[PDB]
Amino acid sequence: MLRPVETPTREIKKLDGLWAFSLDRENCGIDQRWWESALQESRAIAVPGSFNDQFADADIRNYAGNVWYQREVFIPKGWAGQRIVLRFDAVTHYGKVWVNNQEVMEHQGGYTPFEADVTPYVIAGKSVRITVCVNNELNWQTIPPGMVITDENGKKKQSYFHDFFNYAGIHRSVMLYTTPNTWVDDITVVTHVAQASVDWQVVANGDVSVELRDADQQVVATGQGTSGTLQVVGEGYLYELCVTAKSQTECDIYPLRVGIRSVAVKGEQFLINHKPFYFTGFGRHEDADLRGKGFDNVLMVHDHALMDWIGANSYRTSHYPYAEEMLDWADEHGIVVIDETAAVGFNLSLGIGFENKPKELYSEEAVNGETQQAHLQAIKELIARDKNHPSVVMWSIANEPDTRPQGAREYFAPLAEATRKLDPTRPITCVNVMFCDAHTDTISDLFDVLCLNRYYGWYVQSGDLETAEKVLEKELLAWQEKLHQPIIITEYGVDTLAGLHSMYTDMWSEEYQCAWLDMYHRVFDRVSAVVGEQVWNFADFATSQGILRVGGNKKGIFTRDRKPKSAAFLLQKRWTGMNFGEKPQQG
Amino acid sequence: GSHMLRPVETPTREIKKLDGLWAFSLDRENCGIDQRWWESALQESRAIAVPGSFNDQFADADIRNYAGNVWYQREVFIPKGWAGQRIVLRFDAVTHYGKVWVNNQEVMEHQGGYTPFEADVTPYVIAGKSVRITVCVNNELNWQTIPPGMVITDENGKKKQSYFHDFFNYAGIHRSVMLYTTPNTWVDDITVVTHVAQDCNHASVDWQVVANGDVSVELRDADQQVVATGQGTSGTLQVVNPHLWQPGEGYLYELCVTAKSQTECDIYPLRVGIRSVAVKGEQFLINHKPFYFTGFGRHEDADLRGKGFDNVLMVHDHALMDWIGANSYRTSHYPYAEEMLDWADEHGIVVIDETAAVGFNLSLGIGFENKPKELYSEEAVNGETQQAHLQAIKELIARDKNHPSVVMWSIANEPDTRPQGAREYFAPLAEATRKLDPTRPITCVNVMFCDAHTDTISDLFDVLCLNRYYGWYVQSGDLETAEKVLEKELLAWQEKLHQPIIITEYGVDTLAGLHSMYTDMWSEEYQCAWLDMYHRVFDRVSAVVGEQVWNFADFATSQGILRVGGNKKGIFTRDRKPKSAAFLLQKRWTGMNFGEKPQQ
C-alpha cells in the first residue's frame, strides 16, 4: 500500500471537516448498532484533528472508551464504472468503520493508513452514511502500551508510560479513492550509488511498463517488466519514474518520485552518497494548540520555515509515524528523517512521583509474545508505506526501552533481525534511555548506529553544568569504544518557560537553556563518534498532568504557538555557522 | 533558655547598628581563622547590606551557592554619655552559625539561625572611641543542626550543601544588629501568665529575674492609667476587670516593671494581653470560646534580600493578609522576626510559633539519583541532635513566651514517624516542651504520608496539624478522588485522636498567567477549584478548626525538576501580586463571621 496520487486515478477528499460526533460513555454503540441510524444527540467535529481539545471540555478531553463519527457522502457520478475504495490516512489507536449498515473496515494502529474496496457497497451518484468507531485505549498488546484501570465505580481511566498526551480521534486525511480496474497494490524501488543504479517491482493485474523521467520529465530511461536495473549519468534532486500498467482494456498510470538514495554505515561515519554527515535538527512532535495531533498545512509550512531559518537539516519523527505529507516535503526539500514507530513506553523505570504497576517488565503480565507480534506489525506497516521515500534515512525500532530486566534481548533480537529482513537499504537504530548507560545496556549490539537521549545536568546532575560536562564526556568515550559506532544524540534539552530570566543561570531560565545546550555542544565538538545532534523538541507540547510538567513539556526551543526562546538564536548561530553536513571541529 | 527580653526604649537606650553597609568577603579556603582576620581590616572586601541574605545581593551564582565561612565587618563609635552603664551587643539573627570579635576580643558564639544572642561587653569597650566589629558567619548544616543537612565535598574539596527542606538555605545576618545600654541594675528576664474565668475578671501571675535589686510593678492601661500594682521578685499577682486580648482587636496592657537598686533605677515596659488559650475535646478555645484559624503558612522571603527583615515588606504583607480576611498564620519552618510577633500582638493576629526543625525526613525528595538508610540512627538524627532540638525549643519559647499572639508551639514540621525511634526521639522533646511552657498547646505538623493508620507520634501532642495535598502529589489532577481520600482521612484522624485538627498546609503550584478551560494542574483555575473542594470537605468535618493555605507568596527553593523558579504554591507572586485564587479566599474569609467555622 502507498499514498494515492491523482492522474487518471481519482479521489474526493473527505476531510470535509464537520462530521457528526458523539461519545459512547455507557458502551451502547455496537449493541444498538449505531451505524444503522443517524447519531442520536451529536455535535459537530472537525476531521483533520484530535477530538480531545476541540470542545474546551475536560470530560471529553480525559475521556476513555468508544467515540463515534458519522458523515454522509454523495459518490461522484463518473465512477459508476470503477472500484470505489475508502482510505483513512490515520485513525489514532483503533478504528472500525461501517458504510451504510455494512461493516467494511477495522484497524489497530494510530499512525498508519488503512483502506478497503467498497465498490460492491456503493453506487455512484447517491449518498451513503459513513460511521466510524474510534477507540483510544492502551493495553500491553498495543503500540504504544498502557494499562486501563477501572475504579470502584466502573469508570475507566487510562494509564500509559510515555511523555506526550494520549490524543486520539481522526487525526489525518479521510479519502475516497478510485483507480482503474486492473492495478491495485504496491510498488517498490531501490537505489544505488558508485562512489547510479535502480530496481523495480510492481504488483497489479497485468503487464507493466516503467519509464524514469527527470525533473523536466523527459524520459531518461525505460524498461518494462516487474524487475531489472536502469542507470543514470541543501535540498535534493528527485527524479520521477512513471510506472504504467498495460492490461485488460484499461491502462493505469502511477507516478512515483524517486531520489538517488544510497546509504549504509561505515565504521564511525554516517555516510551519505559516500559522504560523512552531521545530523542537525530536532526531535519533533505532532502537537498544536487546538487540533491536538491533527495535521494542518499551515503548521507544516511554518515549522519548516522555522527549521529552515534555524539551520536544521534533519529531524526525527519522535515516537510515532508522522503525516506522510511531511516526508513528501522532506523529499522535495532534502530533509534527512529518522523514521520511528509508535513503540514508546516499554519502560517502567521512568515514571517519577509519590504513587501498582507490573513488577517484571518482560513477562506474560506485560510485554509478552502478543506484544512482540503487534510490535512487528507496527514496524511492518511503517516500512510498508514509507519504503520508497528518499527522505527516510534510517528506521528506529523503539524509543527509550528498559533493557535492564531479564528477557529484553530475547524480545528485541527477532525484531531487529526481522526489520533488517524488511528493508536492508537503510540502517537500523533503537534510541537509548539515560539509565541504560554504556556499562548496562543489553541490546545496543544489534543496531547499526546507536542513538542516545541524555539529560545530564537536568534529571540527574541537579543543575550543575560543571560536573554534567565531565559525566557526559566519559560516557561518550565509553559508548564509542564499547561499540565503535556513530553516535547520534537524538534527545538533549531542558524545560525552560519562555520569560523566566535569571542572573544566576538557574534551571528553568532561558539563560540555563542556552548555557546547557552549548556546553553539550562543546563536548560534541571533542568526540570522534558523535555524527548527529537533534535537540529535545522544537516546540513545547502537551503531556498528561503531573507535578513534573507545567502545562506540558516545556523543553521546546519554541513555545507551543511557535515563538522563539533565546536558545533559538543560539542554535541558529551554530547550525548555520558550520558548513552543510560537516561537523564543527574542536577549537 | 538563657534570659533575654526584647530591647525596648525606657529612660535607658539603644543605638541601631544595622547601618547596612558593612565590609563583606567570603573565606573560600578557610584562611580566616588561621590569619585571624578579625585582627586587621578585611582584605579585599565589597559592600554588603545588613540585614539581608548575602546570597542574592550580587546577582552571582557563585556566591549564591557558596558553602563555608563569610566575614562581615564594621567600625562603630560608642557614644560617650554611656560611661558607667552596661553596654550589650545583640544580634537578633545570624543565620546558622556566628561568632564575633570586638576588634580582638571574642564575645559571643551561636548556632541558632533565627533567635537572638547577646553578651555583656561592658568591660571590652570604653565610651568615646570607635571599635571594629568582625563577624564570622557559617552556613553549613550537619545532622546536629536545626534544621539538619549534609555538606558534601567533591573530588576537588569544594563544599555543596544538601538539605531536606523545600525553601532555599539563605544565610547571613538576617535581622537587627544592635548596641544597647542599660543601667547597672539588671532586669534580665520577665515571665507573665494570664488567667480568665467568664470574661469578667482575673489575674496574671508573674515571675521575674532581675539580677540587681528590688522590683515593683504596675500594670497600666491603654491610657497608661494604673490599674494594679505588685511588689516582689516573683508572685506579683494582681487581679483586674479587664478588656481582654481578643483576635479581632488585641487589647494590650503594659507591665511596667521597675528595678530599684540602692543608687540605680531600671524601667522595663512589657506589653501584655489578657488571653487564655486551651483545647477541649475537638475545640480550640480562646477566652473560653471556640476559634477558627484562617490564613497561611508564610516565609521570610523576598526578591533581593532573601530572608532579611524589612519594614515595608511587613507593613504591605499585613495589609494583604488583612484584606484577604486572614486572622492567623504560622511562622513556617523557623522562628520569625520578633517585629512580626509584636505586630500580631498589637493587631490581634493569632500565630502558631514553630521552630526550625524541618527536614527530619528522607522520604520527601523525589528524583533519579546517597542519603542515610536509618533516619533515627547514630549517623543521622542522633542524641546530639535531640539535645540540639531541645535547645532550639528552649530559645524560641524563651523569646516568644509573653507574646499574646503566640497561641501554640510547634516542635517540628513534617518529620517521618514511620521508622522506629521516631517516638523515642520526639517523646522527651514533647514532654520537655510541656514543662518549658504549660500555657499554650503543643503541636507537631504532620506529613502527608504518615497517614492516620501510620503515624507514630501524634499521641504526644495537643492539636493535630495536617499538611495534605490529595489531588496534587497523589491523585494528581483528579478532584473527585482527592475529595473522597481527603474526607475519609480527616474523619479517620478524628476517630483516632478526637483532637482539634488544623490544616496547616494545603495548596497547589500555580503559574500566574497560566489559564486553562480544562481545570488542569498549574493553572489558576485549578488553584481555585482545588482550594474550593478542600473547603467543602473542611466544612463537612466537625473537628477541623483551622485552615492555612500553603503559602502566601511564591518563594525560592533549591534547584530541581519539581520547582519552576521556586515553589509556586503562593496565593501571591513573590512581588505580592494576587493570583485568581486570592479572590476566592477573600470571598470566603470575609464572608464567614469572624473566628467562627462556616456552618456548611
Ligand SMILES: CCC[C@@H]1NC[C@@H](O)[C@H](O)[C@H]1C(=O)O
Ligand atoms: C529522561 C527521559 C527523558 C524523556 N525522553 C523521552 C521523551 O519522550 C521525553 O519527552 C523526554 C522528557 O522527559 O522530556
Ligand SMILES: CCC[C@@H]1NC[C@@H](O)[C@H](O)[C@H]1C(=O)O
Ligand atoms: C508533601 C510535602 C509538601 C511540603 N510540605 C512542607 C513545605 O515546606 C513544602 O513547601 C511543601 C511542598 O512541597 O510544597
